[PDB]
Each structure stands twice: as structure tokens, then as C-alpha cells.
Design an enzyme around this catalytic site. Structure first.
Site, PDB file in Angstrom:
ATOM      1  N   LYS A 103      37.356   1.478  83.855  1.00 51.00           N
ATOM      2  CA  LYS A 103      38.665   1.412  83.183  1.00 51.00           C
ATOM      3  C   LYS A 103      39.682   1.040  84.478  1.00 51.00           C
ATOM      4  O   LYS A 103      39.767   1.790  85.412  1.00 51.00           O
ATOM      5  CB  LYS A 103      39.452   2.476  82.714  1.00 51.00           C
TER       6      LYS A 103
ATOM      7  N   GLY B  44      45.284  -0.536  80.020  1.00 48.43           N
ATOM      8  CA  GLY B  44      44.593  -1.392  81.078  1.00 48.43           C
ATOM      9  C   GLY B  44      43.652  -2.266  80.762  1.00 48.43           C
ATOM     10  O   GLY B  44      43.773  -2.540  79.470  1.00 48.43           O
TER      11      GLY B  44
ATOM     12  N   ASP C   3      47.699  11.564  71.987  1.00 46.38           N
ATOM     13  CA  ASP C   3      47.502  10.341  71.414  1.00 46.38           C
ATOM     14  C   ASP C   3      46.249  10.306  70.419  1.00 46.38           C
ATOM     15  O   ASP C   3      45.343   9.503  70.481  1.00 46.38           O
ATOM     16  CB  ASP C   3      47.481   9.243  72.186  1.00 46.38           C
TER      17      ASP C   3
END
Length: 273
Positions: A35, A18, A135
Site C-alpha cells: 500500500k 491510497g 471504519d
């Protein structure tokens, strides 16, 4: 209100996650990151106990945001018609580890050791809270340059930790383990450990060990930089091709290379100030 509470500053960046903006909480001038994620871009949904369909990342960030830790904490979140907005802590001054390694090149082992210990502590904390990040990489770690503290970001690819097999992966490939490339199956911890070996290599060599799918599954590690035998041994162990050959977090932290870590403040003084 949404943006009476927060004074929005410049765009920090955008991408798969985003768009992230710099910001301030008006009521006390606390630095925040803001965000914005479009609802159509969210594949992973959860729900809060009170019954609200929130992205999985909000559920996961709430599980890891109690107490102090090396995870960036969710302070607040808002639903809009087409998007969600997350209000997150923001170290100041801050540089991400990818940007740091790009700038300084390979890190001295002393600094890699401190950094890697703190990432291990953060991942252990997440795991204790029921959360798998999925991640872990340099771009997902922020350095508080004054405190010498590392902070994890971006749980948008994460999952609740389970003991059964994951058949989904949406994180970064070149940090993804050989069992995912080959079988599209992994378990949480042993995959986390593989991504940790990619990170440590990255730190001490200044780039990731493997480019293509084929090198990941050959998993032979070539060092381009002078690295200590003990450090090369820890890396190679983390990057064992069989998941069951990989170390536990305990075995990593009890490794000879991981002894006598600097504190965050000493790290900032020697290496960052």
C-alpha cells in the site's frame, strides 16, 4: 532496499486509502499487499518509541499485529520522499465482503453468524490492544475463501482507544452513528457497536439500512428481506439511537442469535468451497 525485497504485481485498487498492489516477498514467496500513501494525504500522525514520525496507521497496526488474529498484519513499512509504503499480509484466494455481498446477495443467517462472530472477535482484539478501527464496514473486511476466515483491513481512519469523547470522524458516513451526525460527538465502543449493526444488516439484507443523514437519526429499521426475529432484534439493539441503549460486545456475543457459530473451516466447506 525497497523493491528488491518485494516483487510487485498488479494494482488491486486505489481510493482514499491510497493505492494497493499485489506482491510477493522474494525470500520465501509469501503473498503480500503493498500500500502506497502520499504524505500530503495523511492527516493523522504518530511516532514510534524510537522517535520516527510515522502515520498513525503504522502505530495502530503495530499494536494489533502481534500474535494471530482476524486483523491483516503489518509485515513491514518504508518511508519514501513523498510517500509511505506498507507491506501487509495477503490471503490467497481472497474476496472483500462488499464484493462478496454484491455477488451473492443477502447472506444466509448461518454464514452471516460466522462472519459477524469473527468480526466481533477481531474488533475485541483491536480494543484489547488499545486500537479503535473507526471504519468497520464490508469493504474493510477480506474473506480468505479457503480457510473461511475474515480479516480486517484499513486502519487509516483509526485512533488509539480512549474513554473520552471523539470529536473527529473520517470514516464512512453511512456507517457513522446518529450522535456524530447530530452532535459531532461519539464514544469509541458505542459507535463501534452502531457500525456493527450496519454491517450485520448489510449481511442479512444485502445492503445498508440507511442512505441519508435523516434516516440514520430516525434510526427506524425496515427489513426488505426475510430475516429472523432474533436477528432483527440484535440489529435493532445495535442500532439503538441512544448510545447507552446499545449492547456491549459481551451482550452481542451472548445474544440468542449468536449461539452455535460455525468454525471458519466449516464455514468455508458449507458456504465458500
Amino acid at each position: 532496499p525497497l523493491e528488491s525485497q518485494y516483487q510487485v504485481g498488479p494494482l488491486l485498487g486505489s481510493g482514499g486509502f491510497g493505492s494497493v498492489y499485489s506482491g510477493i516477498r522474494v525470500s520465501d514467496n509469501l503473498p503480500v499487499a503493498i500500500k502506497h500513501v502520499e504524505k500530503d494525504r495523511i492527516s493523522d500522525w504518530g511516532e514510534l518509541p524510537n522517535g520516527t514520525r510515522v502515520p498513525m496507521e503504522v502505530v495502530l497496526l503495530k499494536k494489533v499485529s502481534s500474535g494471530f488474529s482476524g486483523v491483516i498484519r503489518l509485515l513491514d513499512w518504508f518511508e519514501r520522499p513523498d510517500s509511505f509504503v506498507l507491506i501487509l499480509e495477503r490471503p490467497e484466494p481472497v474476496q472483500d465482503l462488499f464484493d462478496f455481498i454484491t455477488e451473492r446477495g443477502a447472506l444466509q443467517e448461518e454464514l452471516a453468524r460466522s462472519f459477524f462472530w469473527q468480526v466481533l472477535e477481531a474488533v475485541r482484539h483491536c480494543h484489547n490492544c488499545g486500537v479503535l478501527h473507526r471504519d468497520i464496514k464490508d469493504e474493510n473486511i477480506l474473506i480468505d475463501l479457503n480457510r473461511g476466515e475474515l480479516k480486517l483491513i484499513d486502519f487509516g481512519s483509526g485512533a488509539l482507544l480512549k474513554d473520552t469523547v471523539y470529536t473527529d470522524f473520517d470514516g464512512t458516513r453511512v456507517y457513522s452513528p446518529p450522535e456524530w451526525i447530530r452532535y459531532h460527538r461519539y464514544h469509541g465502543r458505542s459507535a463501534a457497536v452502531w457500525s456493527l449493526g450496519i454491517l450485520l444488516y448489510d449481511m442479512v439484507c444485502g445492503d445498508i439500512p440507511f442512505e441519508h443523514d435523516e434516516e440514520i437519526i430516525g434510526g427506524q429499521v425496515f427489513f426488505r428481506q426475510r430475516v429472523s426475529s432474533e436477528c432483527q432484534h440484535l440489529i435493532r439493539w445495535c442500532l439503538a439511537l441512544r448510545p447507552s441503549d446499545r449492547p456491549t460486545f459481551e451482550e452481542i456475543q451472548n445474544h440468542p442469535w449468536m449461539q452455535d457459530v460455525l468454525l471458519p473451516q466449516e464455514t468455508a466447506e458449507i458456504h465458500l468451497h
